[PDB]
Symmetry: D4
């Protein structure tokens, strides 16, 4: 559970990019092909970046859902 | 204002925020309650901003789906 | 009521600066001395920038207050 | 981590967000409910981020109050 | 007075770049050779950008000097 | 943590601010009141941040001077 | 709205992206599929954005070449 | 593989600058004279930054080429 330190590590714009990429996978099934990265340590780093977006997507949906300005349809 | 001009007007930060909000709606059903905005001119402006993110989400999805670095499930 | 167009005009960081300046005035009484600006059109432009921060402060407090993650003490 | 190091770690964007949240608390009473965070490690990280904004709000207030371009009421 | 509108058009980072270029000219004499640009459209745009930085340098100096956190040495 | 990483640690925004502050000092004499900082660790960190700007100002001056688009006046 | 304002209209992030895309085209031949855009107004706007990057690439090339810190190899 | 960590350390704008510098070298031959830096600390930092841009140029080319939105001409 380092996800918050990684928000500051990646920065706002790259954190938002990863969160968008996760949102794309969730509704369309379009997913980065992590198994086509040759080097293992790079695959681990890429997966860390993408997995942060997945976590951030879940945290962001929960936060917006906590506001009376949003509703679940 | 066309969608591309809106991207440049909002800037990358706020464009990504709106795109992420759209992704949350598509997967979560959690939707901004546009109707609860009382002023009709503010309602219109907020709708333009959110609708930009819906467009950008779909354009981004199509672009990633256009690349062999993404798989499709 | 152009305040939203001005968010995009000023940009994220300068919009946040103005909102912070308004928050400072609200709790400390420390306020920019607008009447010491010689030229009238500049005073009008500076007041527009500061007044946007005052509006944005009010909109932001209302939004956070709409979330169950915040409470009024 | 000292407050200045936190500024550089968070970056200007997120530092201003936290400073604005602190300003909202001081004037509105609207306060982030830190206690509702269940994980103790996440609670600590969020508290560090919000407490940075409280510090930055007071440092900013003092700096503006140090200038003849600001009046005091 | 187009300088304040130029700040918002340029944004913070490009505004600071121009102000640093002005500072470099003031202390070293190293100056951009605008007279070598013969496309007058390009020349006028470059002149407006550089002249903004010269104005911003003078306003920034005055503001910092207005603060007890700075001293004229 | 060395000096040579500080551009990326401070980030572009705050590195430009420090460089701007240095340029202001060089031709106006307006200088940050380091003597008013009474925690020696904070003073050291502030001195590092300001001196990075002084160094960056000197390097940027030399780089612009190395270009035939600039002339010493 | 002229060409010479587009740096500030697109902003630094997206101007750098366009410039990067142009550099990729110049040495790899990999080129954006303008022919796949079938709204003529959108095609024109995309062509303007891409050609700004081509122009900026040529200007930046010439500027770096004007410096004694760069050599033609 | 330090290049991905370098992206996050440098941030998007400085990462794109380095990638454009690499693109300029590839198409024009205009190359930074790293051999003129004799402070080996500074030299190594500059080399790491420029070498990142060279790697990023190759990865960015490959990614764009992987898309049906680009064609090799
Ligand atoms: C706009 C993008 C968000 C920008 C924030 C990011 C940085 C902030 C920059 C400084 C502060 C920004 C101030 C701008 C706030 C916009 C206010 C607004 O446009 O909405 C006003 C609307 C009025 O409602 P009305 O019925 O007329 O009430 C009258 C009495 N006020 O009342 C409301 O609508 C209240 C709720 C605001 C809804 C506007 C857009 C909301 C959709 C995006 C929410 C995303 C939250 C961020 C989380 C990111 C997670 C990915
Ligand atoms: C892992 C490797 C990663 C390396 C990548 C980085 C390499 C550096 C260069 C990458 C640049 C990406 C390619 C940019 C080419 C510009 C293409 C373009 O302008 O878009 C054309 C497209 C028109 O498509 P059309 O369907 O006809 O229009 C629909 C209705 N308007 O219009 C569109 O579809 C616009 C879609 C924009 C949605 C984005 C909103 C969020 C902002 C993201 C910021 C970064 C994205 C850059 C967008 C370029 C702007 C044009
Ligand atoms: C951190 C700064 C905000 C960054 C957003 C700006 C750009 C977003 C970048 C991409 C998306 C960012 C994703 C990061 C979200 C952080 C999530 C987090 O740290 O909080 C997790 C916390 C866990 O709670 P727990 O009891 O453990 O629940 C277990 C099941 N999840 O659950 C929660 O705490 C839920 C509420 C989140 C509280 C974290 C900080 C909130 C205080 C700032 C709110 C400001 C909202 C922005 C409005 C600006 C107006 C000025
Ligand atoms: C209208 C005209 C406007 C023109 C202005 C623009 C001109 C360009 C240059 C302006 C730069 C402003 C002055 C920068 C000088 C650096 C001084 C510094 O580093 O701060 C010293 C201060 C130490 O004070 P002390 O009380 O001893 O510490 C308390 C416990 N730590 O530590 C502090 O107090 C730090 C306070 C930081 C709080 C800011 C958080 C939000 C981020 C804002 C981004 C811009 C602010 C730049 C901050 C400089 C970073 C050091
Ligand atoms: C210039 C880029 C330097 C950095 C390159 C690094 C690679 C990545 C950078 C890409 C980012 C996009 C940059 C936009 C380029 C602007 C083009 C320009 O203004 O060129 C004007 C001038 C034209 O000279 P010309 O008359 O055509 O040549 C005579 C030959 N017969 O030719 C010139 O050289 C005049 C330039 C004046 C600017 C001086 C400021 C020095 C540092 C500026 C950095 C930011 C640029 C902001 C310029 C805004 C100008 C409106
Ligand atoms: C924090 C102070 C709030 C006052 C409002 C000022 C507008 C926000 C400025 C924040 C600038 C941060 C970026 C720094 C880049 C350089 C910009 C700059 O130097 O602007 C300062 C200048 C002052 O403007 P002004 O006083 O109205 O001029 C007429 C005076 N008789 O313009
Ligand atoms: C350099 C700034 C140019 C723009 C100036 C515009 C004014 C505002 C800019 C201020 C922003 C802060 C910039 C940080 C400055 C970095 C200093 C540096 O790296 O200089 C290294 C090199 C030293 O050369 P040296 O051996 O000391 O001279 C021999 C004399 N006996 O001397 C050098 O010149 C090497 C520089 C290599 C970078 C080439 C890239 C060209 C465009 C870079 C723009 C962004 C800079 C990123 C550099 C990161 C390097 C780690
Ligand atoms: C949108 C794709 C999501 C995939 C994750 C990629 C990380 C986010 C990258 C967004 C970059 C935007 C800024 C562009 C500046 C240049 C950065 C760049 O060129 O990075 C691309 C590169 C690909 O990395 P990678 O594929 O892991 O390398 C090993 C391959 N065997 O690294």
């Amino acid at each position: 559970m380092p996800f918050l330190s990684r928000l500051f590590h990646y920065g706002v714009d790259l954190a938002l990019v990863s969160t968008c990429v996760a949102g794309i996978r969730r509704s369309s099934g379009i997913s980065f092909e992590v198994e086509k990265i040759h080097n293992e340590d790079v695959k681990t780093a890429v997966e860390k970046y993408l997995n942060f977006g997945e976590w951030a997507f879940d945290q962001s949906s929960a936060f917006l859902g906590s506001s009376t300005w949003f509703k679940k349809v």
